[PDB]
Amino acid sequence: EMVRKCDPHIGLLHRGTEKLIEYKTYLQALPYFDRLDYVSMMCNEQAYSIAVEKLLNIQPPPRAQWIRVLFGEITRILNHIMAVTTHALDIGAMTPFFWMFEEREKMFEFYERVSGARMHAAYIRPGGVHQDLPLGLLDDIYEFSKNFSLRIDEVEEMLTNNRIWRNRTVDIGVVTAEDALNYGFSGVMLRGSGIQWDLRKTQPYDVYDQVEFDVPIGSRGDCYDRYLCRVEEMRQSLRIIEQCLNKMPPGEIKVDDAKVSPPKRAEMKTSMESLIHHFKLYTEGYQVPPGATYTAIEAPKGEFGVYLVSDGSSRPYRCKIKAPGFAHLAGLDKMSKGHMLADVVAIIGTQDIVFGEIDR
Amino acid sequence: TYKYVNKKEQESEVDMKSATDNAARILMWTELIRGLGMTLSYLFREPATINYPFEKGPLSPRFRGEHALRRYPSGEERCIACKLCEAICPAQAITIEAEPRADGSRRTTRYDIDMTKCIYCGFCQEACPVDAIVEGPNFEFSTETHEELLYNKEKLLNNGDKWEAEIAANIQADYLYR
Amino acid sequence: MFFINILTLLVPILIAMAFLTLVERKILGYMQLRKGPNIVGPYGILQPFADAMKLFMKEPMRPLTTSMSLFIIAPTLSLTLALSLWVPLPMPHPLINLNLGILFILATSSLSVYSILWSGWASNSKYSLFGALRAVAQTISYEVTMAIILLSVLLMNGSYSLQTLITTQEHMWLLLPAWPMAMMWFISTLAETNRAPFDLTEGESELVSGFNVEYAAGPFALFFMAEYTNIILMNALTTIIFLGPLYYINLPELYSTNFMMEALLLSSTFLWIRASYPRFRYDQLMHLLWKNFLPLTLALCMWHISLPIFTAGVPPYM
Amino acid sequence: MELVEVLKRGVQQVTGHGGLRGLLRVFFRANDIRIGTLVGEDKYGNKYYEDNKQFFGRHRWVIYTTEMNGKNTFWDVDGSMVPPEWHRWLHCMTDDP
Amino acid sequence: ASATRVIQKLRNWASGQDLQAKLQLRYQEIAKRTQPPPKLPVGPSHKLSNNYYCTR
Amino acid sequence: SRAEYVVTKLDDLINWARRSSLWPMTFGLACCAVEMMHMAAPRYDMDRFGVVFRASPRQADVMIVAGTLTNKMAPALRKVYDQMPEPRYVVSMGSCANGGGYYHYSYSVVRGCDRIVPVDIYVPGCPPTAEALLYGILQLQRKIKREQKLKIWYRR
Amino acid sequence: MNLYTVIFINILLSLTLILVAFWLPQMNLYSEKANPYECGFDPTSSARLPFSMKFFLVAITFLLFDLEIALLLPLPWAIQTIKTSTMMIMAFILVTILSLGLAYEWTQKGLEWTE
Amino acid sequence: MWFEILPGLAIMGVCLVIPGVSTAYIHKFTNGGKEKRVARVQYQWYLMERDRRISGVNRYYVSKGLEN
Amino acid sequence: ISAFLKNAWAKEPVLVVSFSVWGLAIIMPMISPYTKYASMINKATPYNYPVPVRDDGNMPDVPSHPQDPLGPSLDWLKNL
Ligand SMILES: CCCCCCCCCCCCCCCCCC(=O)OC[C@H](COP(=O)(O)OCCN)OC(=O)CCCCCCCCCCCCCCCCC
Ligand code: SF4
Ligand code: SF4
Ligand code: SF4
């Protein structure tokens, strides 16, 4: 009942999203990113949007960036709830799941009030953001955030000082820093081994330089350290939501350049220029210049990356998507050495694993 | 800035009191009675569940669900076969085939939506220049046949004539944002 | 009239199993911030009957790789032992007055293991065999401690008869003399019956329903109700041994009522424990139940041998 | 004390649906008794009650009919029978029935 | 909100901390569902003068 | 009174049993499974209806295809559907499984689970709200309620 | 015969129940449903092959400790003897010997599993 | 709410109470206003076999007294 | 060694309890005065008939009847 070799045969959520993206426009291709990592939706489309903005040499405005980082941290709390509670289900503890999926339902209500979809909101666009958030929503995010600390404290009371959780996560999945770097890990799988690295700090992409928070780092590369790191990332995302609420400046939410981002619905019904631009944007696209980029963000799993290749056309020529989870699964066999089937189950749960990005 | 989560500041201070406290943590499962008490607290709370068919989940006007083809207040058909709802549809769900109507009007002879290809993205309704096709509130249109979920002009117009009393209100609420 | 007695002992135990399933689901629900079944009956008091009927209408699975004899015979044995264990139980006057009741219980349970352990082999598959070997490890872990705990506890009762514990506890409980033995007995009853956190044989996230992955219908139902019957049995044993209720020779139904109360409390405690904690590992269970429970168990057995003597408290042989 | 007051509230719940017939007609049919304010009755039979002292999934609810279009929905109930005028208020897109 | 003041005590003791103030549910402290209409603002490049697309 | 009436009421009973206790499978492939979890979650609790998961397909009465079905994962789906013991039902959940969905025209996608398993009920969405999946499950209950098997057996 | 009767009753309950479970329902058998599970895919080999057990030493010492139980279990009758010193010393010796053996196994890493 | 669990608990308790009171009353009914005799040693069995052979009817539970 | 036991009461307190209870079980029988009444009580129990004895004419200390003064007065078992 102990493992001598692991050969993950992924390929069962391989659809061909990259080829379909080559066949679609830059706006048509956006929901694929919502659908790749399907518990951290807005972060994937944030990455895509940043890449296309870089190719366009265009920046979004302050308000759009602020609500973008706000919903990025909301996605972090989503996926960390997901990862922690699924890891616990695997290990046997099932009550955090039901305690926290109510909070996830509230978060989905935020998504459905902002967009009209609980999960696959195509809200982060290349040119800023689609739709301005409604009256009376920051109050609700505040009312949620003031109590989520109590919720996460309940979970932490259940299964941090426990003996079964400790005995079942500690000295499990131990990774050296050199092994992590060479195998290609990112995010929490680095910070658990003790590598001070976070792109929100080193390569800030929307407003993260303008907002303060701390990066949890672990001293042992066991599962317990990179469980507490996720818990503290949830707390720090809450700390950042506080700031993003306290400053959310007024102004346009999308780039005021109607050759990239579509105009107002009434502006396209009194002006001919903006109607032409509506037409071409919503039928042809906006013709990003040639070139290429690699842009990466801290997805809640790690370094979600997109290598776009372009041309004068309104479509992309290549879009590879780096999946944090690809390299983690590659390192699965290394991390499970002298361990058992149950400990391997825990190691699967620890990587924050999801296969829409891996297979894609 | 960073911070350690599981790094002891320093060790090597123990007396018989701390030993007693640790040995009573052990041998009494004291950190497990806390979990028992937590689950006991949750037994005496109001559960978050709802009697679904009789009381339901909260939605917003922006919610995007079943589709519909709308009309003007005069009853005139509002689509004009500008054929860009299918240009942008990233699933290739929409087809149009259009002709003059014998009144001398740009109108459709076809408006199909394979709702088994639709991803419910809203691009069609934010691309239509006349607010003709919308994505309404109905999420309770499950079927026992694949062929029922392949719609045409008549089904979409039935939806519109059904859900206009809701869609008009949702649009009235959500415009000034779109 | 003995057959009517069999009825009054057997059918209510089966209804108790059936409604324990409901109570489990609803308690776990409310701990999980939800309402369990409240639809099929008024408050869901028909879901067990629905489950049973639906299970007995499903087509049973006779695989090709299987050994059909052991396959069909293991659930039979499981329920038969789960239902024969209730026989000597004094509540307060038993159905069958044995002089070595605790040995009957011990042997019956050590044989109840073989249901799991032959169903898993007969069901020729991998996760099935994993569940079987995990059952072997579990029994290796718990049987020694169960026996020596029970010895130390009855070493102040004077006999293996279950009915003598009622007079041993006429003015007190055996929980205050032996709360440590009671702790370890509780957790060994938790390791027995394959109940969480010591489940480790239908460990749905480690194994895909071990020793039942190939069982579908009424056979699986038999395993189910055997488990949920042994739960109530072990709670009844804990409350007959340690939580001794009041006999009152004129009022024996009082004994029966307090027995009911304490058994329900301890069963709800099992469900509570399922809801609260994660699962052990079947090697960590060995390490626990050999390197923590067996030392203290032997030490306290020495103590309980000394104690009748240096206190002049040697009990009577009837 | 307060135990007696919650028992009184339960007595009111038991005794605010007509009688035994009217109580069972709601209890076997919706698995709830909670009394609220009648917002309005529909042109098919639906009732659309309300009680804002509850939380934000139960402050509004429906009690369906027993015959909508010759279908006998006394037992076979479905959410497709809420027309759009009340769909909007029931799914909480409005505070305006 | 309705916990009869002794079950409130039980749950606040077993938990470890006051949770009647920080509840999992929502009663009246939420942004209500029908709202006033907005007037969304208008970004720069609406200058009406000294704004040519070749410059920005 | 009549044998046919007795048969009708017996069938009502067996349908009530199979309807009030249908045990789905832990079989979710893609995003739609997250909304299945949310249905399992407190707000739209499934166990309220007698709908609790079981991991083995032999202790299961229904399978919910909550995700995209690929050419590499179709044999496994069919093995699982086969291993399920009859009476058994299927719920296709999401556009990716009703039809091919957003991945209809791709090389590694089957354009509907209709081609591999027989579907009883189709739930649309990308994703379908767990509210909607719950509606579809109750619609499957209603479908079981009108099976009329022993009736037709008597009429053979 | 009372006990024989109770056990026969339980036996016949179980067998009647299995008879019902098998001959009441409907059957649609075919080779693709009657073959072992292995999670959707097919097995790569048989399950009637060696499963290396890594706690065999623990199993054997469990057997010896079972015998120790069998020796300790006469104590409730051994206590009503007149001596009450020989039995004390001998039970002390037995338990202490068992504990010594457990300690030797523990220190020699017999309770650890064969990785 | 949590008081919606008390029905199932009540059925469970009413079902667990019956095996005891039922056994007690069946014993008293067959043996007759008397607890069912325990015979743990051969002496008690001797007493019961005796009382059987005293009765005139093969029943150990008639309790002939000082009318002889 | 006091420091060693101080360390072991924190780390591994299960074996400390075990050795303590073992030594206590061995030492406490040596201490008590009630330890000797156990054999005497086990002896007092008459599981078998006290067979009478023939009057040789030289049995003064042996009683002629159950409730005579002679023989072992079991009043030490009373009010123990
Ligand atoms: C007069 C002088 C003589 C007196 C002599 C008496 C001296 C005092 C004796 C006290 C001894 C009490 C018994 C303690 C046994 C447990 C031993 C122990 O150390 O805990 C075992 C286990 C270890 O946990 P761990 O943190 O890993 O430490 C081990 C490091 N080697 O930890 C565990 O077991 C936890 C895993 C099991 C979890 C199961 C869930 C438990 C839930 C609690 C329910 C409690 C209800 C009990 C009610 C019983 C009623 C019958
Ligand atoms: S975009 Fe609107 S008007 Fe144009 S074809 Fe589509 S529905 Fe008709
Ligand atoms: S919502 Fe999106 S996928 Fe669906 S029909 Fe409209 S454009 Fe196509
Ligand atoms: S239909 Fe949409 S939500 Fe469902 S699996 Fe496909 S992409 Fe994901």
Curated annotation (Swiss-Prot), chain A:
Dimethylation at Arg-15 by NDUFAF7 takes place after NDUFS2 assembles into the complex I, leading to stabilize the early intermediate complex. Core subunit of the mitochondrial membrane respiratory chain NADH dehydrogenase (Complex I) which catalyzes electron transfer from NADH through the respiratory chain, using ubiquinone as an electron acceptor. Essential for the catalytic activity and assembly of complex I. Redox-sensitive, critical component of the oxygen-sensing pathway in the pulmonary vasculature which plays a key role in acute pulmonary oxygen-sensing and hypoxic pulmonary vasoconstriction. Plays an important role in carotid body sensing of hypoxia. Core subunit of respiratory chain NADH dehydrogenase (Complex I) which is composed of 45 different subunits. Component of the iron-sulfur (IP) fragment of the enzyme. Interacts with NDUFAF3. Interacts with NDUFAF7. Interacts with CERS2. One of its GO terms (cellular component) is mitochondrial inner membrane. Its EC number is 7.1.1.2. Disulfide bonds: none annotated. Belongs to the complex I 49 kDa subunit family. It comes from Mus musculus. It is a peripheral membrane protein. [4Fe-4S] cluster binds at residues 223, 229, 244. This is NADH dehydrogenase [ubiquinone] iron-sulfur protein 2, mitochondrial. Its cofactor is [4Fe-4S] cluster. The keyword Electron transport applies. The modification Symmetric dimethylarginine is found at residue 15. Its main location: mitochondrion. The chain holds residues 104 to 463 of 463 of the full protein. Binds 1 [4Fe-4S] cluster. The keyword Membrane applies. It is found in: Mitochondrion inner membrane.
Swiss-Prot record, chain B:
Core subunit of the mitochondrial membrane respiratory chain NADH dehydrogenase (Complex I) which catalyzes electron transfer from NADH through the respiratory chain, using ubiquinone as an electron acceptor. Essential for the catalytic activity and assembly of complex I. Belongs to the complex I 23 kDa subunit family. The keyword Hydrolase does not apply. This is NADH dehydrogenase [ubiquinone] iron-sulfur protein 8, mitochondrial. [4Fe-4S] cluster 2 binds at residues 89, 118, 121, 124. It catalyses: a ubiquinone + NADH + 5 H(+)(in) = a ubiquinol + NAD(+) + 4 H(+)(out). It is a peripheral membrane protein. Its cofactor is [4Fe-4S] cluster. Its main location: mitochondrion. The keyword Mitochondrion applies. Signal peptide: none annotated. One of its GO terms (biological process) is mitochondrial respiratory chain complex I assembly. GO terms for molecular function: 4 iron, 4 sulfur cluster binding; metal ion binding; NADH dehydrogenase (ubiquinone) activity. It is an enzyme of class 7 (translocase). [4Fe-4S] cluster 1 binds at residues 79, 82, 85, 128. GO terms for cellular component: mitochondrial inner membrane; mitochondrion; respiratory chain complex I. Its EC number is 7.1.1.2. Binds 2 [4Fe-4S] cluster. Complex I is composed of 45 different subunits. This is a component of the iron-sulfur (IP) fragment of the enzyme. Interacts with RAB5IF. The chain holds residues 35 to 212 of 212 of the full protein. It is found in: Mitochondrion inner membrane. Residues 70-99, 109-138 form the 4Fe-4S ferredoxin-type domain. Keywords: 4Fe-4S, Electron transport, Iron, Iron-sulfur, Membrane, Metal-binding, Mitochondrion, Mitochondrion inner membrane, NAD, Oxidoreductase, Repeat, Respiratory chain, Transit peptide, Translocase, Transport, Ubiquinone.
From Swiss-Prot, chain G:
It is an enzyme of class 7 (translocase). It is a multi-pass membrane protein. The chain crosses the membrane at residues 3-23, 55-75, 86-106. InterPro entries: NADH_UbQ/plastoQ_OxRdtase_su3, NDAH_ubi_oxred_su3_sf. One of its GO terms (molecular function) is NADH dehydrogenase (ubiquinone) activity. The keyword Transmembrane applies. The gene is mt-Nd3. Its main location: mitochondrion. Belongs to the complex I subunit 3 family. Core subunit of respiratory chain NADH dehydrogenase (Complex I) which is composed of 45 different subunits. Interacts with TMEM186. Interacts with TMEM242. It is found in: Mitochondrion inner membrane. Gene3D superfamilies: NADH:ubiquinone/plastoquinone oxidoreductase, chain 3 (1.20.58.1610). It holds the Pfam family Oxidored_q4. It catalyses: a ubiquinone + NADH + 5 H(+)(in) = a ubiquinol + NAD(+) + 4 H(+)(out). This is NADH-ubiquinone oxidoreductase chain 3. One of its GO terms (biological process) is cellular response to glucocorticoid stimulus. Keywords: Electron transport, Membrane, Mitochondrion, Mitochondrion inner membrane, NAD, Respiratory chain, Translocase, Transmembrane, Transmembrane helix, Transport, Ubiquinone. Its EC number is 7.1.1.2. One of its GO terms (cellular component) is respiratory chain complex I. Core subunit of the mitochondrial membrane respiratory chain NADH dehydrogenase (Complex I) which catalyzes electron transfer from NADH through the respiratory chain, using ubiquinone as an electron acceptor. Essential for the catalytic activity of complex I.
From Swiss-Prot, chain H:
One of its GO terms (cellular component) is respiratory chain complex I. It is found in: Mitochondrion inner membrane. The keyword Translocase does not apply. It is a single-pass membrane protein. Keywords: Electron transport, Membrane, Mitochondrion, Mitochondrion inner membrane, Respiratory chain, Transmembrane, Transmembrane helix, Transport. InterPro entries: NADH_Ub_cplx-1_asu_su-1 (IPR017384). Pfam families: MWFE. One of its GO terms (biological process) is proton motive force-driven mitochondrial ATP synthesis. The chain crosses the membrane at residues 1-21. The keyword Transport applies. Complex I is composed of 45 different subunits. Belongs to the complex I NDUFA1 subunit family. PANTHER family: NADH DEHYDROGENASE [UBIQUINONE] 1 ALPHA SUBCOMPLEX SUBUNIT 1 (PTHR17098:SF2), NADH-UBIQUINONE OXIDOREDUCTASE MWFE SUBUNIT (PTHR17098). Accessory subunit of the mitochondrial membrane respiratory chain NADH dehydrogenase (Complex I), that is believed not to be involved in catalysis. Complex I functions in the transfer of electrons from NADH to the respiratory chain. The immediate electron acceptor for the enzyme is believed to be ubiquinone. This is NADH dehydrogenase [ubiquinone] 1 alpha subcomplex subunit 1. It comes from Mus musculus (Mouse).
